[PDB]
Design a protein around this ligand. Structure first.
Ligand SMILES: [Mg+2]
Length: 319
């Protein structure tokens, strides 16, 4: 049997008022969630700092939410993004960050009025906190230069953001709907010779012009990493010569895969690839009508090829 609750009139009145007021505080903080707030440093622990926001509001910037070489003294004014509010937490309930990408984004929202007005949209942001960052922007307004608005007059705006982030070097890149073009943009200041897009694997091979290699990679691989993070594509950087050489190796691997797992001769495999059939997946599930465009292949053979291809697919997947 469920329990029957008994309280006093005083208890109930007090409880309902406490809860109504507590919910108001929670709601207000949830309104400013994802925004930059300013706090005063109270205590500087070994793995975090305490912030005063007024009205008994205590916020924390954890170690992993700080910039690498940042040191704070009790009483300092610090800004950061309130990215998580946890009402039922026994410890801290307000979490502030300076290292997450949202910090970079919100700093640009402030510094660039065109972003505040939602005339310019931020489509991606990738950071290596304290060191380097990329941010992608776009506009649907024919009057606006989105990169220029973010850089500002003589770079004053982007420098302002960089200074707040301790000299973090920021590349402002133009968004593009074509992934290859976007990645080319994100790879700056590198000069790309050519890109091969593996759409199935969601990876890109990037050939970089001579002398532009160290830039393309960046120190410690920083630039291609940031470009990978910004675009969401896996990126492989190499020389022009390497890319050509890799292409031949892939062209042979396709034929050999066909010869081995379909048990056909090399001339047969070649014809398949020539007609645009380059993978075991394609052979398996292509409309059988598309395979009839090849002169020399009857309906029985195209049925047998599919069944061999489907078997190879099952074989490989379990291997
Ligand atoms: Mg390739």
């Amino acid at each position: 049997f469920d329990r029957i609750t008994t309280q006093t009139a005083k208890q109930v009145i007090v409880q309902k008022v406490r809860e109504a007021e507590r919910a108001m505080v929670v709601d207000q903080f949830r309104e400013h969630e994802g925004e930059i707030i300013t706090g005063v440093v109270k205590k500087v622990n070994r793995d975090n700092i305490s912030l005063d926001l007024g009205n008994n509001a205590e916020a924390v910037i954890l170690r992993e939410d700080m910039l690498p070489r940042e040191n704070f003294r009790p009483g300092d004014r610090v800004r950061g993004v309130l990215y998580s509010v946890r009402p039922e937490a026994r410890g801290a309930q307000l979490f502030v960050t300076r290292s997450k990408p949202e910090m970079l984004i919100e700093l640009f929202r402030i510094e660039v009025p065109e972003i505040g007005e939602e005339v310019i949209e931020i489509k991606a942001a990738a950071r290596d906190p304290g060191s380097r960052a990329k941010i992608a922007v776009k506009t649907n307004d024919k009057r606006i230069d989105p990169v220029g608005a973010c850089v500002g007059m003589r770079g004053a705006r982007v420098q302002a953001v960089s200074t707040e982030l301790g000299g973090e070097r920021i590349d402002i890149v133009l968004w593009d709907d074509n992934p290859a073009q976007f990645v080319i943009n994100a790879m700056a200041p590198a000069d790309v010779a050519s890109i091969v897009v593996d759409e199935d694997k969601h990876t890109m091979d990037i050939a970089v012009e001579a002398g532009n290699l160290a830039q393309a990679i960046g120190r410690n691989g920083q630039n291609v990493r940031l470009a990978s993070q910004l675009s969401g594509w896996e990126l492989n950087v190499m020389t022009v010569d390497d890319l050509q050489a890799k292409h031949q190796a892939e062209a042979h691997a396709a034929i050999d895969t066909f010869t081995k797992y379909l048990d056909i001769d090399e001339d047969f495999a070649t014809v398949l690839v020539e007609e645009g059939f380059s993978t075991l997946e394609e052979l398996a599930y292509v409309p059988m009508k598309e395979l009839l465009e090849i002169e020399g292949l009857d309906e029985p053979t195209v049925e047998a090829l599919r069944e061999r291809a489907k078997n190879a697919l099952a074989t490989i997947a379990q291997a």
